[PDB]
């Protein structure tokens, strides 16, 4: 069995925009050079958060049919998925894109940025669970697209339009699971398990931001005003 020419086309358009994504060198150099203070470590994570927002929007814009949606629903989808997409991209950066030494330094910085263990521990737990799945680039790109095109996010006026965009991505991901892992019929179910685990980070994240409202060091108006 194989993907139909239309499914190959759809996957190609998703792979192309996903492969364009790159963590800039200036952020990488900072992980290596900057002071190990809570303020400097937090400033590095602020740079990573702002980079993710820019990368997420450029990726989403190139998703087949995204620009055909009503403008307000495009905003609602980006707002509702930004946090879940951050954890997915972060998992990939930590487990595949960053060299062993650089990731160990990034983890050191995260664990010393002034953020409570309550908001650090589930994050590293998720990275380990994702890494266990030995996910391909195709699976990372499709999951990211499925998370963004979730028709159940708040403040979407035309959910059916979004359903029509997400359903063919789920068919493609299941077909890729049946093609590349035929001896493991539960591989698709393992990928859906990551979707449900990602949703729990929204309440953890919102709780984390709400607690910074009486803090002068951690309060970042650019990201806080939206999320």
């Amino acid at each position: 069995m194989e993907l139909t020419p239309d499914q190959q086309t759809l996957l190609h358009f998703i792979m192309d925009s996903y492969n364009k994504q790159r963590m800039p060198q200036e952020i990488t150099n900072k992980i290596l050079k900057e002071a190990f203070s809570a303020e400097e470590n937090f400033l590095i994570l602020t740079e990573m958060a702002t980079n993710h927002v820019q990368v997420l929007v450029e990726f989403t814009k190139k998703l087949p049919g995204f620009q055909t949606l009503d403008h307000e629903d495009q905003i609602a989808l980006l707002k509702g998925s930004a946090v879940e997409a951050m954890f997915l991209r972060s998992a990939e950066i930590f487990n595949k894109k960053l060299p062993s030494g650089h990731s160990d330094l990034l983890e050191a910085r995260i664990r010393n940025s002034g953020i409570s263990d309550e908001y650090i521990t589930p994050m590293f737990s998720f990275y380990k669970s994702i890494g266990e799945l030995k996910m391909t680039q195709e699976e990372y790109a499709l999951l990211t697209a499925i998370v963004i095109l979730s028709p159940d996010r708040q403040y979407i006026k035309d959910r059916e339009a979004v359903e029509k965009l997400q359903e063919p991505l789920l068919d493609v991901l299941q077909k890729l699971c049946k093609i590349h892992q035929p001896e493991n019929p539960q591989h698709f179910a393992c990928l859906l398990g990551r979707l449900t685990e990602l949703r729990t980070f929204n309440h953890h994240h919102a709780e984390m931001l709400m607690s910074w409202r009486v803090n002068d060091h951690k309060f970042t108006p650019l990201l806080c005003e939206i999320w």
Binding site: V53, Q54, V57, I75, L78, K79, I226
Partner: peptide
């Protein structure tokens, strides 16, 4: 919404 609107409409 201003930042997202700008990045989306660029």
């Amino acid at each position: 919404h201003q930042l997202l609107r700008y990045l989306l409409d660029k």
